[PDB]
Amino acid sequence: SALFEPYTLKDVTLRNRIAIPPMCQYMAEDGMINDWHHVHLAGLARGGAGLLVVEATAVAPEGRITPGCAGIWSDAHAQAFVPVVQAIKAAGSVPGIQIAHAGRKASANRPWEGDDHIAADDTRGWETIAPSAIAFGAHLPKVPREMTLDDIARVKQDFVDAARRARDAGFEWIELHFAHGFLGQSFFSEHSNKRTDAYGGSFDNRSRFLLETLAAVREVWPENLPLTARFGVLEYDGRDEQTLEESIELARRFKAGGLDLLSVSVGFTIPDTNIPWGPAFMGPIAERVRREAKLPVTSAWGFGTPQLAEAALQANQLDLVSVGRAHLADPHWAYFAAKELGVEKASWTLPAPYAHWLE
Amino acid sequence: SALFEPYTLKDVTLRNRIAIPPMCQYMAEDGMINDWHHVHLAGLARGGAGLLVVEATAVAPEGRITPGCAGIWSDAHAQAFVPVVQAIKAAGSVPGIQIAHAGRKASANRPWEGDDHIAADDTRGWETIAPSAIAFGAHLPKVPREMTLDDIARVKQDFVDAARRARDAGFEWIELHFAHGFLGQSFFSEHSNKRTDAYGGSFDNRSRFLLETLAAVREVWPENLPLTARFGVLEYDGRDEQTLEESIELARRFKAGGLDLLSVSVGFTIPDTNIPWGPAFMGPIAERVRREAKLPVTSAWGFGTPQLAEAALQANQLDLVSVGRAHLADPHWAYFAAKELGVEKASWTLPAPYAHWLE
Ligand SMILES: Cc1cc2c(cc1C)N(C[C@H](O)[C@H](O)[C@H](O)COP(=O)(O)O)c1[nH]c(=O)[nH]c(=O)c1N2
Numbered sequence: 001s002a003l004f005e006p007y008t009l010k011d012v013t014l015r016n017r018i019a020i021p022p023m024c025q026y027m028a029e030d031g032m033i034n035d036w037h038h039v040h041l042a043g044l045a046r047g048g049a050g051l052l053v054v055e056a057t058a059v060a061p062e063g064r065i066t067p068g069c070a071g072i073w074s075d076a077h078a079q080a081f082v083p084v085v086q087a088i089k090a091a092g093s094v095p096g097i098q099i100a101h102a103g104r105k106a107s108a109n110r111p112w113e114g115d116d117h118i119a120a121d122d123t124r125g126w127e128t129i130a131p132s133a134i135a136f137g138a139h140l141p142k143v144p145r146e147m148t149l150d151d152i153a154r155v156k157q158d159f160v161d162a163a164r165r166a167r168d169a170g171f172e173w174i175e176l177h178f179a180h181g182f183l184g185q186s187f188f189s190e191h192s193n194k195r196t197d198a199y200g201g202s203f204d205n206r207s208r209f210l211l212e213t214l215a216a217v218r219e220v221w222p223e224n225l226p227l228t229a230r231f232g233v234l235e236y237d238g239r240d241e242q243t244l245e246e247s248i249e250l251a252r253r254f255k256a257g258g259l260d261l262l263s264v265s266v267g268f269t270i271p272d273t274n275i276p277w278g279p280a281f282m283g284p285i286a287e288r289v290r291r292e293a294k295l296p297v298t299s300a301w302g303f304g305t306p307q308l309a310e311a312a313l314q315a316n317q318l319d320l321v322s323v324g325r326a327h328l329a330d331p332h333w334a335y336f337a338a339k340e341l342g343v344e345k346a347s348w349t350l351p352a353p354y355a356h357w358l359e
Numbered sequence: 360s361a362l363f364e365p366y367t368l369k370d371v372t373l374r375n376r377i378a379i380p381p382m383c384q385y386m387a388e389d390g391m392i393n394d395w396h397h398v399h400l401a402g403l404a405r406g407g408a409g410l411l412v413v414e415a416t417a418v419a420p421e422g423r424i425t426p427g428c429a430g431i432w433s434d435a436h437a438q439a440f441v442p443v444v445q446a447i448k449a450a451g452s453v454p455g456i457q458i459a460h461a462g463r464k465a466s467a468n469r470p471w472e473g474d475d476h477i478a479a480d481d482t483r484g485w486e487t488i489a490p491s492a493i494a495f496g497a498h499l500p501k502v503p504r505e506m507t508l509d510d511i512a513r514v515k516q517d518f519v520d521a522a523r524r525a526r527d528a529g530f531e532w533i534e535l536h537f538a539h540g541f542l543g544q545s546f547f548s549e550h551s552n553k554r555t556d557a558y559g560g561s562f563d564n565r566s567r568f569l570l571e572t573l574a575a576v577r578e579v580w581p582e583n584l585p586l587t588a589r590f591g592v593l594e595y596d597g598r599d600e601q602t603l604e605e606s607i608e609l610a611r612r613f614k615a616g617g618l619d620l621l622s623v624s625v626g627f628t629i630p631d632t633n634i635p636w637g638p639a640f641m642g643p644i645a646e647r648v649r650r651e652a653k654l655p656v657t658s659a660w661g662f663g664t665p666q667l668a669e670a671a672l673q674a675n676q677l678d679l680v681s682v683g684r685a686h687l688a689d690p691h692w693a694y695f696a697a698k699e700l701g702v703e704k705a706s707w708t709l710p711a712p713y714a715h716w717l718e
Pocket residue numbers: 021022023024025055056098177179180230300301302303304322323324325326712716
């Protein structure tokens with residue numbers, strides 16, 4: 001089965017092609033993770049996936065999505081990850097982390113607590129920052145503060161510091177969160193970036209924050225560990241062919257700047273869109289990026305059945321298949337997939353205290 | 360759904376009728392549990408089951424089954440359970456523990472490391488003890504040492520100390536392991552007990568170790584927390600009607616001695632048997648014990664599908680359904696069962712960071 005073939009990228013070898021993508025848990029306190037995350041992540045690692053990427057972890061307090069988001073903006077925050085990294089490795093999975101800044105989508109309630117921008121008088125909220133003072137709209141009406149050049153320098157340095165901390169906490173894979181309408185995606189998109197300085201206007205200028213952040217992170221992130229990013233390559237906003245072309249050009253520049261793999265996603269930059277949700281819907285788009293940028297890719301958003309995952313790999317649409325919600329439902333999804341695909345000794349996807357009894 | 364109705368026993372309320380029975384992990388070191396157990400147990404508790412009973416935990420070093428078995432024979436061993444108990448409670452499940460002594464089946468290899476008695480010259484092994492100097496046979500050929508009266512007193516006191524430690528570690532449910540051919544079961548069975556003192560011969564004498572241990576534990580175990588036992592009520596050895604009758608009489612004596620619930624199992628006292636493995640095969644036997652002893656019961660050994668579990672409850676064969684291997688395969692089995700049985704808001708069997716996305 002293609003799904004169960006190992007994958008090597010730089011010095012890291014994944015035991016199979018199942019990746020658990022970053023999934024926010026909304027359970028941290030002032031950015032500090034706790035035994036929620038420890039058990040959640042260690043349990044997933046034991047389930048058999050080759051790669052486990054920790055949820056969007058804020059590079060700065062104002063870059064959290066919500067008051068429950070994880071952070072890595074101090075050494076104390078980083079040290080909280082050390083035992084979790086060690087548990088993921090003990091289970092034979094590769095520990096990764098997504099480092100993030102939510103931009104104009106920050107200062108929001110948890111999804112089961114309203115999912116909307118926090119009220120002005122709620123003591124939990126904060127001022128958001130963005131390339132331009134324009135609100136997302138809908139349930140996120142807060143107008144962000146337009147960043148100064150010094151803000152841009154500061155946030156870049158926060159990504160560098162976050163990457164350094166991740167490295168020293170023992171992560172073996174990093175993902176820069178340039179997707180989903182958060183700060184990086186919002187610099188790239190003309191919907192959200194109306195700047196007239198070096199960081200807006202032209203393709204080169206809109207790309208600049210992302211490319212400069214990648215280059216700065218590259219200075220501290222080891223060359224022998226995968227350096228990756230998540231990026232929304234289209235919006236489903238009626239501008240798809242032009243946006244895809246620009247996204248592919250940016251992907252080429254990321255590759256030239258040392259990116260090892262791209263997680264291909266949707267922008268979610270604005271609310272007025274028509275995303276065609278369905279099984280494996282991102283497959284053809286991921287394949288086009290893979291082919292036109294000549295870069296390994298993963299994607300998600302409906303690949304969470306064993307046959308869909310296998311088909312995507314065999315068609316060379318993807319190099320890794322990211323499976324999210326199915327792992328919330330069943331942390332041992334990789335074992336389920338091994339059984340479904342008829343892998344020999346499928347139960348040994350799991351550790352011995354489980355595998356022995358399930359054979 | 361009957362499976363999702365709460366259950367109250369003494370001062371403890373279970374959120375549903377799904378119990379996770381004790382399942383040895385073989386991952387402890389000199390009896391001390393570690394992050395294997397912490398993550399395993401906390402993850403299961405979060406999966407939604409109402410009751411989680413920790414694996415057979417030895418009351419004394421020689422009462423371990425294997426070198427990987429958990430122990431509770433010192434205060435340091437007990438303290439290792441405290442954070443796990445706290446994690447189980449944080450997840451809304453009730454923490455229980457099975458306290459045990461493997462008797463003649465002790466000093467064995469882990470099941471995936473031979474499953475047989477440890478070789479005489481292996482530095483990991485030890486002398487086993489039992490009511491009589493008679494080997495189990497087959498893959499467990501070691502002849503145990505016949506216990507003295509002082510050994511009997513000592514082992515009883517070890518059960519008392521174990522129960523006291525469990526209480527002080529915060530467990531809310533205790534199960535005395537009098538099943539599966541281990542020390543207690545072997546005192547009851549005429550196959551293994553050939554003693555001619557007060558602890559063998561007659562029904563009263565063969566029952567004596569078990570009843571005395573129950574009474575001694577009762578002196579330290581709080582009256583407001585369930586006091587339970589697991590007991591093999593037949594062997595499938597050609598003596599089933601007579602053995603069942605005696606087992607039911609003993610169950611009546613356990614009830615009179617303060618037992619709140621009986622986990623009805625098979626003896627496994629000797630190898631030469633013909634157990635009719637199959638779906639829910641213990642249902643009729645459990646129902647007979649429940650009715651003839653007038654005691655709540657659980658059982659296991661093939662109830663691990665949602666419809667089988669529901670049927671057993673609706674037929675009043677069982678009060679709780681124990682589901683073992685299905686939980687090794689899928690720690691979120693309770694959520695799977697809720698979905699299968701059409702429970703409203705099935706995803707809220709799980710905690711919010713999972714439930715919200717699965718509705
Ligand atoms: C609970 C939860 C939380 C998050 C997500 C999703 C879910 C369900 N997603 C998106 C996620 O990585 C993935 O793309 C989607 O879940 C789609 O894949 P599936 O169809 O669920 O396999 C996500 N994406 C991301 O880049 N960073 C994140 O931290 C989060 N957080």
